Design a protein around this ligand. Structure first.
Ligand SMILES: Nc1ncnc2c1ncn2[C@@H]1O[C@H](CSCC[C@H](N)C(=O)O)[C@@H](O)[C@H]1O
Lengths: 265, 265
């Protein structure tokens, strides 16, 4: 009669909360999805061993098209858990799944976990200054999406930071790197000439948030474009004008050049 | 010899991540602050019991003025943890504490935890659509804060949602309710008359996120301003233009007026 949406957190199997773990262990059935995002610091095997339950992985179609006949039926007469990377309901499509549960007469509860949305606080950038978020998508064939560029423009002109999720081919487990994202943005800039993203733009790269050893780097595109930030996942941020406290953190903790203290504040 | 900033999460002691718990259990000294937010589902005793360590609680003055005199000295020869509600670096000024650690020759690590900043996904509003955030502060003396009103205006004009953290006076055990936040906003509206926040404005209230049964309500100010949303903490959200699926969730899960389903594209 109960369905639990449980977040797995940022990077590895220990990023789930104690609450989520204890509840998952008590569930008769445990499902999971790894298409909205991946848990790069662990494996399905390690997650299963921690929970002590067999985990049935669901594809995007299994969920978007058949959630009500795969998961809900069991949730009707058993306690069922649905695991997702990060924080449940951050992925735009998950919220609606609670409506499906209601429609099927199944109770649902949400057990939160750390999300990259809040984890960016580790970059020293004030969370309240983050504006609208966007995803940098690989251009395919004759399709060259560029809306994320406009998101940066609108945020930055209002002095706000822009969190940029990078493209990922879930099932294929291949991530877009911050370097590729910077290359694409420079391409988009050369096409729109909005003076939004250039070699002189200050950016921040956050890699493997959740890990004890994440890579946090800040600097100008011209210097970071070919830098090695380590293994995925990568997150790219284009900050707006900086409060001196943010700039000093980027310098002391993210190795940013002293130049940002006079150019970006 | 290390300093760990470890988040405890949204509501109770089990909102800590497994990673955070396992690390905290092995620290030599554990400090904490409980003035940045309210964890309404636990007690210091219960947290101490879970971690198996004695927790020294610090006040805002202890941290802001003497972090380097109370915590850092021990971190030089021992494994020390500093615990905070929610995520340690979200809507706090704790990030700067890492600079103090650096200058004192102490390496620091951050362990994230569920944050209200991302937990708002449970309202059904798309997280990427949230713009700049703000805090509704209690007026004091002849000083009556109003910036949060301009934030709402700016975000709304772009069709973005606005997350409003509500004030807290931990030492006086005063926690601003969504009702009090709405009353203050109506006063600012009369003062500025920008048509930003009125009785017909749609708002969303989220109380005690993290608990298994948080209060999630959506409706017009005129109808919710006197509604009892239960015990604190409370967060107030002023949505921008809604997507049809956001409206559906607000109606189905947050009991919003069925008339909002009819969006004005
Ligand atoms: N569980 C919860 N439910 C509702 N609001 C919450 C909340 N936890 C925090 N808040 C809101 O945020 C304010 C604290 S701001 C500090 C937030 C914290 N670092 C975090 O990551 O959540 C509170 O005054 C309240 O308005």
């Amino acid at each position: 009669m109960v369905l639990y949406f449980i977040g797995l957190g940022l990077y590895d199997e220990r990023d789930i909360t104690v609450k989520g773990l204890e509840i998952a262990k008590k569930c008769d059935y445990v499902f999971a999805e790894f298409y909205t995002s991946l848990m790069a610091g662990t494996t399905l095997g390690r997650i299963q061993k921690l929970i002590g339950k067999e985990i049935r992985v669901l594809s995007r179609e299994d969920v978007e098209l058949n959630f009500e006949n795969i998961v809900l039926p069991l949730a009707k007469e058993n306690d069922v858990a649905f695991l997702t990377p990060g924080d449940p309901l951050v992925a735009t499509t998950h919220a609606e799944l609670r409506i499906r549960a209601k429609r099927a007469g199944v109770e649902s509860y949400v057990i939160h976990a750390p999300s990259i949305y809040s984890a960016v606080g580790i970059t020293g950038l004030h969370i309240y200054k983050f504006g609208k978020s966007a995803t940098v998508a690989y251009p395919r064939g004759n399709w060259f999406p560029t809306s994320y560029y406009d998101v940066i423009k609108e945020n930055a002109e209002r002095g706000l930071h822009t969190l940029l999720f990078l493209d990922i081919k879930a099932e294929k487990r291949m991530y877009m790197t911050a370097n590729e994202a910077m290359e694409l943005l420079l391409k988009v800039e050369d096409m729109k000439k909005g003076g939004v993203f250039t070699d002189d733009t200050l950016v921040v790269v956050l890699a493997r948030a959740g890990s004890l050893n994440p890579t946090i780097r800040a600097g100008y595109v011209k210097d970071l474009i070919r830098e090695d930030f380590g293994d995925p996942p990568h997150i790219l941020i284009v900050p707006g004008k900086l409060h001196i406290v943010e700039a000093e953190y980027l310098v002391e903790i993210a190795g940013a050049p002293r130049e940002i203290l006079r150019v970006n504040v």
